[PDB]
Amino acid sequence: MRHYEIVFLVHPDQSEQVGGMVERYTKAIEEDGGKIHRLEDWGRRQLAYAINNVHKAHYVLMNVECSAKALAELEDNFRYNDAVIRNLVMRRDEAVTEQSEML
Amino acid sequence: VKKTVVDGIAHIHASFNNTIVTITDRQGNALSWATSGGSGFRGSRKSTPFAAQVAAERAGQAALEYGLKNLDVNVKGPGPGRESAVRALNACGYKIASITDVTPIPHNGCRPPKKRRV
Amino acid sequence: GVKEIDYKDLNTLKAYVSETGKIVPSRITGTKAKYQRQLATAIKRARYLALLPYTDSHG
Amino acid sequence: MALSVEEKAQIVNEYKQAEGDTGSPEVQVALLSANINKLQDHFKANGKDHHSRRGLIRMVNQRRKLLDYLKGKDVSRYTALIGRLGLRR
Amino acid sequence: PAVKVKENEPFDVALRRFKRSCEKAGVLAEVRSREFYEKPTAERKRKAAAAVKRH
RNA sequence: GAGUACGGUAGAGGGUGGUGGAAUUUCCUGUGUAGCGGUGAAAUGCGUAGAUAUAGGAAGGAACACCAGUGGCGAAGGCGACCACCUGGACUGAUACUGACACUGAGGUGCGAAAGCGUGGGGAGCAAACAGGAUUAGAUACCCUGGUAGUCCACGCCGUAAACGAUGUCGACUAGCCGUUGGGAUCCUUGAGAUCUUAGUGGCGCAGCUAACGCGAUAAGUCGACCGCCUGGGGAGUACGGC
């Protein structure tokens, strides 16, 4: 029941299944009362530095409203998936729906 | 032999006690090198900017045999000769595309040694 | 100019990033103490996601 | 302040002496007791949280002081409070 | 700490811009401070004097 | 006075787990050739078995550059990378509620830097001891080259510091001026400053105090409650006994 903002980087070779992964996560998050209040896709951005060896990656922005179990389950998916790298989960006191990066 | 390298990179490892100039390619393969201590300057004269340019000039002409005319300067470390060695690269035939300081800066990492109680 | 400082908003972030990639002090920019504290946490947080370099000599 | 607003709103009305009453010692003692017992779970898992234990001790001392004042005022009201809350161990 | 030499200028003024970039970044001061380990008492004592001089 | 209920604000407050970048070291590989390193100068040391330098890769540990600020939080000791979880307090606005429920505190109990001790891990840098090189009349040092405990982690112990603001806690009063942090109110609704107010944090300064230095709303001024402590220096915070 806490608003979480998640930004994760997907490997450039796995850029075309970021839709397949996000559709899995959104389904897997709302099965216990979750809702997605925000979801963008910043696309293949040139990295300021190489994470491991890639200088470009698929950023995905997603703001959710979940519980402890759902957030731990989702964070588990990020950890045991080499496709995604350099993820960050934020806690928000309020839900937002603007873009602020696309423009 | 002649590698026939046109683009190079020059590294100046200037320190408080010695200055090591090393000319390398774009992939970090060294061709020539000279040091202030290797140019007849020992002791108080090894840590002087004049010894630095002598080292840079000595390695500079040793590097033209590869047919090198373009290089980027990568000066690293403090000391008397960080700039005096670069000015030596201009006296001999060369054009410097860029000058960059690559001195390593810890982000408060390993503990440095203690103050000298001289 | 009612703008909220955030890590995605890179355009104003670069205004408070020095040429070498450091964070400019509040004295140079004349920023309020509250804004700079929230400004710094955005630069570091965006630094994590490879949006900004930690230093200019990255590589 | 580990108690949520729902839990605080829950226990205030069961121990209020009248409508709108949130300052009576019964509400205070019940408010502290629920927070004291809730924090016991945290200090079991976090045994090195000495700084949060200073606050817990203050809540224990505060509850003792309130009960001693309720002792002087009305001993019958004091007796019902600890019996309902299970204090005086 | 990084300058690019442009077309049709002397290399001398390319040097002066280079160190001007260096002191702007202050790399020489940073390496001087990390030469030896300054104890927390000596570091806090130095910063206290820095605040006094500023005021 | 003290406290509770509500919204909000800031924070290196604390605990538990992950994650990142810079750098050091070690190892592997390529280039490449006489030095590197160090100092006042040297030498010990490293290097022709290919060092240093340079480039690519790997492992590992520790601390978190810039932000950074007589800035912030904490009872004090202390706390600086980011994120998630658990959690304490403070500040702030009005209304609502209890109605002296308060202060201090011998014993007692809890926390308490660093060093140190025990068990188990870990170990990159630094470095008591130790070894060698210098300097010196000598040098069990200062300087240099190495380097063990330790520094790191968990669980226990210790219980001491110039643990200092060398200033016990709490409450009230007594000109002002110049900064700064978190709020609030009113003019400015200003776009953007100004005036009050509050909790901190600094610099001058009237009065007052002080042996003087200086303190001066964060008092060492005018008071009040309580507590701790002192009675010339050395012997000595030592001996003896107790814990």
Side-chain angles (χ1 to χ4, degrees):
Chain A
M1 294 48 275
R2 333 153 93 101
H3 316 332
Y4 285 101
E5 173 180 336
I6 291 127
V7 172
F8 58 98
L9 275 66
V10 181
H11 205 273
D13 310 30
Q14 280 87 312
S15 269
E16 61 60 18
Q17 45 288 76
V18 317
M21 303 166 342
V22 62
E23 73 197 54
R24 144 145 47 91
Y25 306 145
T26 166
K27 177 23 190 153
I29 176 49
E30 53 198 305
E31 100 307 329
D32 52 353
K35 309 79 82 163
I36 288 66
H37 297 213
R38 165 137 74 111
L39 197 186
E40 286 88 326
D41 170 343
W42 313 343
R44 221 169 272 131
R45 178 169 298 62
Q46 162 71 24
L47 264 43
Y49 53 88
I51 289 321
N52 46 15
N53 269 308
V54 281
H55 301 72
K56 100 191 317 283
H58 203 106
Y59 298 76
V60 185
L61 191 184
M62 148 175 33
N63 181 344
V64 297
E65 199 275 348
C66 60
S67 65
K69 149 63 154 313
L71 192 271
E73 210 209 272
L74 169 37
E75 223 197 278
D76 163 346
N77 275 105
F78 290 137
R79 164 170 326 106
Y80 298 126
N81 186 6
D82 40 327
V84 318
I85 68 197
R86 200 63 63 93
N87 56 279
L88 196 95
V89 188
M90 227 87 54
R91 166 133 188 233
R92 313 249 56 72
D93 40 321
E94 86 294 355
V96 317
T97 327
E98 292 47 20
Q99 327 335 332
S100 72
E101 170 81 298
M102 305 292 345
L103 50 147
Chain B
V1 293
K2 270 83 177 177
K3 204 180 173 181
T4 75
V5 277
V6 47
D7 289 329
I9 294 168
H11 303 275
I12 318 99
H13 186 271
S15 147
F16 288 104
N17 273 333
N18 206 341
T19 314
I20 300 168
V21 302
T22 278
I23 297 103
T24 206
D25 320 332
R26 296 290 157 151
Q27 322 72 317
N29 269 281
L31 329 171
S32 47
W33 63 266
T35 75
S36 326
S39 316
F41 308 102
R42 268 291 149 205
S44 308
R45 326 217 325 290
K46 198 179 34 147
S47 36
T48 326
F50 170 50
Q53 39 174 117
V54 175
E57 79 78 353
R58 254 203 317 140
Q61 33 210 294
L64 311 143
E65 171 274 352
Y66 294 64
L68 194 70
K69 316 318 316 273
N70 323 316
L71 46 72
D72 315 351
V73 161
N74 267 357
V75 53
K76 143 190 301 181
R82 51 166 41 277
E83 336 283 1
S84 97
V86 180
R87 99 155 40 83
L89 284 169
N90 88 11
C92 76
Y94 272 131
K95 71 55 181 173
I96 287 107
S98 98
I99 326 176
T100 305
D101 224 310
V102 202
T103 307
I105 283 321
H107 293 183
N108 227 41
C110 290
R111 174 163 176 145
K114 46 185 192 157
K115 253 70 190 83
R116 299 180 71 240
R117 286 185 314 275
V118 246
Chain C
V2 191
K3 58 187 82 66
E4 321 321 328
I5 181 46
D6 187 32
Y7 63 88
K8 340 198 173 44
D9 181 274
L10 255 47
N11 282 345
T12 87
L13 248 61
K14 330 302 280 273
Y16 310 111
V17 174
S18 147
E19 196 56 38
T20 164
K22 297 167 139 217
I23 303 185
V24 278
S26 211
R27 22 183 280 272
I28 315 276
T29 301
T31 311
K32 281 174 322 310
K34 193 201 171 144
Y35 202 71
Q36 182 82 236
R37 276 192 279 92
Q38 195 168 0
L39 186 179
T41 207
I43 294 199
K44 302 201 219 75
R45 166 129 73 161
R47 254 167 191 179
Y48 176 62
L49 294 163
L51 300 156
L52 290 114
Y54 280 85
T55 183
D56 65 313
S57 294
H58 253 199
Chain D
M1 45 177 204
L3 279 179
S4 66
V5 278
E6 331 295 16
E7 268 227 46
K8 267 142 136 173
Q10 213 311 332
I11 58 195
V12 54
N13 56 64
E14 331 266 356
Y15 296 87
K16 71 172 142 33
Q17 308 308 282
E19 285 268 328
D21 182 15
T22 80
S24 66
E26 293 90 351
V27 162
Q28 318 246 341
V29 171
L31 258 283
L32 292 169
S33 280
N35 218 354
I36 283 155
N37 287 33
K38 204 168 147 63
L39 262 301
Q40 291 293 3
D41 274 79
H42 156 83
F43 287 116
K44 241 58 154 203
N46 306 82
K48 273 223 307 223
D49 206 15
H50 298 320
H51 289 67
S52 310
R53 207 176 242 103
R54 276 329 96 74
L56 168 87
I57 293 317
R58 218 191 26 81
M59 306 164 16
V60 174
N61 301 129
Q62 193 60 237
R63 183 182 63 184
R64 175 94 292 264
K65 282 191 267 186
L66 282 153
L67 277 158
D68 295 313
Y69 149 81
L70 207 41
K71 195 171 257 294
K73 272 332 171 175
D74 164 338
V75 313
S76 89
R77 214 137 74 101
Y78 151 49
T79 278
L81 178 64
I82 74 196
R84 165 153 47 270
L85 283 210
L87 287 281
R88 284 323 315 249
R89 281 81 73 238
Chain E
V3 317
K4 176 70 55 153
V5 190
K6 311 155 176 318
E7 59 268 16
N8 285 85
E9 76 246 21
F11 163 76
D12 171 339
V13 86
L15 229 59
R16 333 281 209 71
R17 179 177 65 290
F18 173 60
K19 330 111 190 163
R20 286 195 294 174
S21 288
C22 279
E23 29 185 2
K24 192 93 185 143
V27 290
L28 280 195
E30 259 177 349
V31 307
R32 284 249 155 61
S33 82
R34 266 158 228 263
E35 187 74 55
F36 290 133
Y37 176 78
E38 193 182 23
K39 283 155 200 263
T41 81
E43 173 261 19
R44 80 187 79 218
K45 230 187 57 180
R46 200 185 38 41
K47 294 272 198 22
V52 169
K53 283 277 219 303
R54 240 182 288 122
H55 205 59

